[PDB]
Amino acid sequence: EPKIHYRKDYKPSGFIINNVTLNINIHDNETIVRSVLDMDISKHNVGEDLVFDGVGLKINEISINNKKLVEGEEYTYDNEFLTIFSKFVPKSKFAFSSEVIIHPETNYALTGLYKSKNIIVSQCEATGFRRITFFIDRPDMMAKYDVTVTADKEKYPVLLSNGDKVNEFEIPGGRHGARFNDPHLKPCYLFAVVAGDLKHLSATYITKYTKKKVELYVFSEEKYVSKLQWALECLKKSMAFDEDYFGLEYDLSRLNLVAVSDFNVGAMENKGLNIFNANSLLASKKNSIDFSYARILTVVGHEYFHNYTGNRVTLRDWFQLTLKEGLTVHRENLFSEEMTKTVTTRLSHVDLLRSVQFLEDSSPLSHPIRPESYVSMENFYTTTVYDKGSEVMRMYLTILGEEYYKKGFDIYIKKNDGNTATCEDFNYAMEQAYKMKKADNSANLNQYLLWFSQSGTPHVSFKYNYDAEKKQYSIHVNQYTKPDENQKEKKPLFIPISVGLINPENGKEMISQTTLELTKESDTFVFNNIAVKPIPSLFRGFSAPVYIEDNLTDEERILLLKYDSDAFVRYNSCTNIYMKQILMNYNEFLKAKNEKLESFNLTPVNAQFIDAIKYLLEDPHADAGFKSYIVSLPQDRYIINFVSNLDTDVLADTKEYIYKQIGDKLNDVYYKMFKSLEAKADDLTYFNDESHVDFDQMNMRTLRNTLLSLLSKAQYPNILNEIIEHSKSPYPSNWLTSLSVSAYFDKYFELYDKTYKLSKDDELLLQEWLKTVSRSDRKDIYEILKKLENEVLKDSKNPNDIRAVYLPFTNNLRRFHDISGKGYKLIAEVITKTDKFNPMVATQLCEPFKLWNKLDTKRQELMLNEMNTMLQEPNISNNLKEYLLRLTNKL
Ligand SMILES: [NH3+][C@H]1CCc2cccc(-c3ccccc3)c2CC1(O)O
Ligand code: NA
Ligand code: NA
Ligand SMILES: [Zn+2]
Q1: Which of 96, 190, 238, 849 could join 37 via S-S bond, C-beta 3.0 to 4.6 A?
Q2: What is the CA radius of gyration of the chain?
Q3: For residues 350 and 542, is the Cβ–Cβ distance under 8 A?
Q4: DSSP letter string, 166-225
Q5: Residue nearest to atom 11 of ligand 1 (CA)
Q6: Would you say domain 199-284 falls under CATH 1.20.1110.10?
Q7: What is the DSSP string of 788-806?
């Protein structure tokens, strides 16, 4: 083979597009798109043919400077590229015009212009604008847009495109139109249009410094207008945060957010017209689970922060994607951490990175955050680009500190405003701030660029020495990145290591927290006036995206878990104790399986560790959010990073043993806490207020729901009574948990029907119910999936429905990885079926295959057979074919 684009090959276009004037005329069975491109010849032109991207368009006519061009003689069109022969391309400013027909009403791939229920909506990132009209569809082609939309007024009373609405007009035959002018130069991936019978809430915002009045609108279909308020509040918070932290003010008189039901991704930052998966915009406390609130906060914030990091400064080319995505995720993380004031925001992000992203980075799909090549750029909207990218963007803040970070960021945003940029431009701006901080104009960040170009997760390991006579402590540090298919030689990175030192006798800090800068393969950091042997607190806040090998004893880790100040180090110390136990018991079960032993031993869980868990849980003044992290074992996708040829049944046995060891000691504690937390966790303050969320209270419910799961799996005496009462709670997080945990009881199908009836009248709540069933720990899960298919999912093409039914189930370690391969077969069937109408979502459904080469060799073969069968399917999409060829080491 397919067509591969390479980062090194970037060259500017020989053409310029200065203005785009669109007329989009929507009818029931066709949409007519007329477009005039005011174009010119660039200084790079060498007399080449004029080639436009245009995919699946039906040409009515195309013209240059008022004369229609003729197919064969002056142009060719192959359904992908329109080529105008150079002998017919003007040598100076010219107008290119075209009229094409498209069909949003049958566009089930949700790229370009499409119909979502009764809403017409676009999605153009990355390369979708070419599915609407002809363009040089790449992000360095920046232009100004004048867009007119017309439609039946009864069906489509609300018409939106980017920018100021400059005219509204009636049209004979029951139609109407609206015209928009977007004064900000933009690439075409930021174009959007919406038409629908939309309802809204609105507010007026006044910017902090320029005192500009901004009208804020949030839109949904009529049925769900009551679910729009939290999004509007989140938008106001986002605007204030960008003003307060970054000095950045919104730059149009109006900002619209729109929820649609059918959306391939979370949302999209189209200028002045952000469009969202409804599941990331709409919520209400009676019809959404708790996690919806942080999700909406994240996604609204993310899309708002793109207004500068992506829109006002955009991308030279798609290889720079992390420049807007890593940076915008980092901005949203700062925002969400400040808004929630919990440990959950940061720890949740780290947990996702160290599971999903670390898995990706050790898989055949491993790439640097700035990739070197692609076929379908939609396959590179990855956790690597977004989440490792965000950690790389966060490390600049750790290295520079807040003052100089803000200085460097403002250099970047000012210098590149209204223009494209590259990752090097960001590093240059940060380097200017670095020279200031170090008071050294010879200092540079050249080594830092390796975070953009080098793939793989570094491993950072430690050795310690304490001289009690000298009161001198040394931390010897080593870094190593495993060679991979991107680099045979790996180089040392600039790794910032935020550290403290804890006195094990009293739990107190012994030094001012300090950031060590490891730039060599190894280094020794010495500390004087250390009065007693400390326990080091390493990588506070998770200060670099690495595998941490602390070389601490479990006794030392327990002391950090109890007494350290840093939430991440406490949680990581607990994680490391669990991992040591998991690897040991896994090996014991594995040997017993392989050697067909009739009897054998298992290493018990450390009793002092269990005591420490009890100590933390029983502390009435300790944080409920943190507590939920310590009672759960690490995620399977984290564990797999530390085991080769992983047998998933052996791992399931391992985790069950460990959980039962701890529960045998702590179940009475868990039950007492589950009961004692009820009053505050389930208090109804703010239940009618969609402008305020108590994130601490939410973490109390999370803790209760985590404990209830543990007690239910343990068959704690009479816990079904608590489950049934829990099913009567007003909070969906609780009553959906009651379904999950009832899987271990004969009441499961009673609660299945009860909660279905509570969910079925709200589209998003029903999707949450589907996820709850899909992830239920049921021995009959395969028959339950068939029931969902036949009774609820049916023929839906809504990505939220399909993903809800199948993805949670793929994380069922015992069932999805059944040694028959039946789970691999089931999901591959869904992938192949979905690829015939939505290649992006089909490729998303491939997620469970990413770890194929980490499993035992029998499961490797079963997964490879299904992947190779998918690759043989006629008319497989480029998206899915690229993904599977790369994943199977063919590309
Ligand atoms: N520019 C777009 C591209 C699409 C895309 C793809 C994958 C993930 C995400 C996303 C990340 C965090 C929160 C919400 C959505 C997005 C949204 C986006 O805005 O980055
Ligand atoms: Na439907
Ligand atoms: Na639907
Ligand atoms: Zn983004």
Answers
A1: 96
A2: 28
A3: yes
A4: EEEEEETTTEEEEEEEEEEEE-GGG--EEEE-EEEEEEEEE-TTT--EEEEEEEEEGGGG
A5: 266
A6: no
A7: HIIIIITT---HHHHHHHH
Q: Which architecture characterizes domain 456-551 according to CATH?
A: Sandwich (2.60)
Q: What is the DSSP pairing of strand 459-467 with strand 472-480?
A: antiparallel
Ligand 1: which residue has its CA nearest to atom 4? 265
What are the residue ranges spanned by the domains of the chain?
12-198, 199-284, 285-455, 456-551, 552-891
- Measured in whole angstroms, the distance separating CA 311 from the mean position of its chain's CA atoms is 19
Cα-to-centroid distance, 362 and ligand 4 (Å)? 24
8 Å CB contact between 831 and 880: yes
- DSSP percent split of the chain into helix, strand, coil, nearest 5: 45, 20, 35
- Distance CA(308)–CA(234), nearest Å, equals 18
Strand locations in 119-163, DSSP E? 119-123, 143-152, 158-161
SS3 313: strand
Taking the C-alpha atoms of residue 180 and residue 225, their distance in angstroms, rounded to an integer, is: 25
Is 352 near ligand 1, meaning CB less than 6 Å away?
no
> What's the longest Cα–Cα distance across the chain?
94
Q: 798 C-alpha to center of ligand 2: Å?
A: 7
Closest ligand 1 atom to the C-alpha of 303?
Answer: 19
> Resolution in angstroms, to 1 decimal, for this deposition?
1.3
Please tell me the number of the ligand nearest to residue 326's CA. Answer: 4
How far, in Å, CA of 613 to CA of 626, rounded?
Answer: 11
198-206 and 213-221 as β-strands: parallel, antiparallel, unpaired? antiparallel
User: Is the CATH number 1.10.10.1100 carried by domain 552-891?
Assistant: no
CA-based angle 566:571:575, to the nearest 5?
145
Within this chain, domains 285-455 and 552-891 share the same CATH topology = no
d(CA 300, CA 238): 8
Q: Tell me which of 314, 331, 385, 386 to substitute to probe ligand 1's pocket, judged by most ligand atoms within 8 Å of the beta carbon.
A: 386
Secondary structure letter of residue 506 according to DSSP: T
Q: How far is the CA of 55 from the centre of ligand 2 (A)?
A: 27
Q: How many residues does the chain have?
A: 891
Q: Whose CA is nearest to atom 5 of ligand 1?
A: 265
**Experimental technique:** X-ray
Q: Is the CB of 266 under 6 A from ligand 1?
A: yes
Active-site residue set: 303
Choose the CATH number for 285-455 among 1.10.390.10, 1.25.40.10, 3.90.1150.10, 3.40.50.300: 1.10.390.10
DSSP secondary structure, 93-124, as one string: -EEEEEEEEE-GGG-TT-SEEEEETTEEEEE-
What does CATH list as the number for 12-198? 2.60.40.1730
CA–CA separation, 457 and 449 (whole Å) = 15
CB of 269 within 6 A of ligand 1: the answer is yes
